[PDB]
Amino acid sequence: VDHETGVRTRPDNLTEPGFIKIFTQKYLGGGVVDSNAIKILELPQD
Amino acid sequence: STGVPADGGYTVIPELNTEIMRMLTDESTMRRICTVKKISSNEFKQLVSAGGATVNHGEEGKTREQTSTPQINEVSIKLYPVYAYPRTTQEIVDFSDVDILSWLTGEIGDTFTETEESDLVVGDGDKKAKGFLSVPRAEKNDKERDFGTLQVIKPSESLAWTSADPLIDLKFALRKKYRKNAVWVVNSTTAAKLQKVKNANGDYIWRDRLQAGDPDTLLGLPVEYLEFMPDNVIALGDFKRGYYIVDHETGVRTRPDNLTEPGFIKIFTQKYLGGGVVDSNAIKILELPQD
């Protein structure tokens, strides 16, 4: 799941002067919908 | 009358001169006497050839022997952030006729000139411009002395403030190469002490030998005074060659930073100042005992 805005990069160069804090943000989400569609296999690792 | 506020006294408004008088303004003598190299880097490397190139004065019919290849020295002048971060209230910046933004930028630029005359002279070099005085000194001639160190003359208190001998020594410690376009660098208090030197007889040595149109000189060379020098310390040299003031290519960069804390606008106006001794043979230092 993504947001309509997506990746947004705001280069805050004011709050801490002498610095650019490049605040890059992306709203990300993930969920297992219909778990019957996915299967897992843990190897014995010897 | 205007004396009584009620009797037409409130009508008279005081005409505030919209150009604030910046008391501490001065044309930066450092930036004029020394060269200014706008650069885009943290460190500026000027190559300063020490010398050592020789000739053997060959004869007609003699094998031409190898001559010594001249040497080069590195002067690593690193730029550092000299800044001021005043937090003016947004109230004044709005409620004003004298423009506080421009006035404060001018005041901080004058402060930058003052701290240039401080760092480029006395500045130890701890994350700032290394002044020529903070540069280690050595009482040796140009041939014997190590590069990156300035020739310092340290006479006794007897002939220091009694005669012109220390200053003549300082003048001719420089080579003609530098004395052509040399300049003196004295503190105002040290300058006053110099103008007061009187020999055993009592007459002044420097007998104010100037005309009205003459700039203040000393032993036939101009004297650009620096106020941040320590007491009883003198310098002299071709500071165009002798010292490099390495400013960054951006220069003064005044972002007002209005969003960090609303109700306050915080002019940052940081600059990147660097400074270093270049041609350590082009500057001479004269230490005089404290009276």
Added chain:
Amino acid sequence: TVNHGEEGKTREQTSTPQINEVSIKLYPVYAYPRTTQEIVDFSDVDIL
């Protein structure tokens, strides 16, 4: 003032410079000589 900040150091607050007021008040400097109209009329050197 400036604090001569380093590479990787928080930039501390510097003192904001001060301003002073010089209130120069204007006052009437005058002279009120009472010349006779006689001289002002009877003259070649312009008395006014």
